[PDB]
Structure 1
């Protein structure tokens, strides 16, 4: 399969670049907005993306006999101006990851690769999981105007049989 190889290479690319952008966003949150726990939350996301999400693709390429490609071009030229705008940007990125994974699953099923539809089930599920736990934090900025209350709730968040 060359179409599956191309799609999975693209997914690897996007995961690396999201990881780097999230690292920068966590620095900007902790430093410029005085919210260290929002920074720890975004940093947990960044480590998640730069770890197992590409570790698994490399392992699968070892097992099935496909080729790997590395091509990265990241740049951060503009940041949001609040913390609410920051977390809303994060939400949009996750929501786009969902559609990319859906396209991959459809492609895997259209060619009779049932081992590639089995692999992509993990990503199908983790997409909804991560989007849900990001919306959890998005919703707090609509419930309160006090930054310290929000930060205490996020601290408590930081420190399921189908999805979880």
Structure 2
């Protein structure tokens, strides 16, 4: 009884993989934001997202697997072979990737209900909430590139974003 769902196990190993590979791309994008685009605070913002993906995002999946008999797979391949041409396109690409996360997570929630896997549906709620929270944070930075042509003005707003004391939203936090 209570035998783990192989399909959920697969989708969650795929999501583990995505979060590792995303985190490694974001670490590269963070380097480039500072080094090539002269935007160290944009770099810090993207580096923090890197550490979220390679941190709690993958960690919680590994922890979940230990509780329920699911098997962890580590199979990672990613190469950063071209970069967006400027900072605005850099954060727009981060935006595009986070939007894809929301769609991947939606599939996992739908699958958990289909499997009558209510522990997995419960578990994935964190990723449902964080999918939109993460997109909103990236959106707040995308907006800046449309509200000013001055990189240092943009950088000052990003600086207060990354140095603000995090206070969770009651629902999305």
Question: TM-score interval w.r.t. the shorter chain?
Answer: over 0.9
CA RMSD of aligned residues (A): 1.3
Matched, 1:55 2:75: no
SS across alignment from 1:139 = helix
* Unaligned residue ranges in structure 1 (runs of 5+): none
Q: Give the TM-score taking structure 2 as reference length.
A: 0.93
Q: Distance in 1 between matches of 2:31 and 2:57?
A: 22
Structure 1 segments, 4+ long, off by >2 Å, are none
Aligned-pair distance for 1:160? 1.4
Q: CA deviation at 1:148?
A: 1.1
SS at match of 1:34: coil
- Name the SS for the 1:161 alignment partner: coil
Q: CA deviation at 1:78?
A: 0.5
TM-score by length of 1: 0.98
- C-alpha deviations, 1:52-78, integer Å up to 9, x for none? 011100111000011111101110110
The CA deviation string for residues 72-122 of structure 1, in whole angstroms up to 9 with x for no partner, is 111011001110000000000000000000000000001111111000011
Query: What is the distance in 2 between the residues matched to 1:135 and 1:160?
Result: 16
> What residue in structure 1 maps to residue 99 of structure 2?
95
The residue matched to 2:122 in structure 1 has which SS? Answer: coil
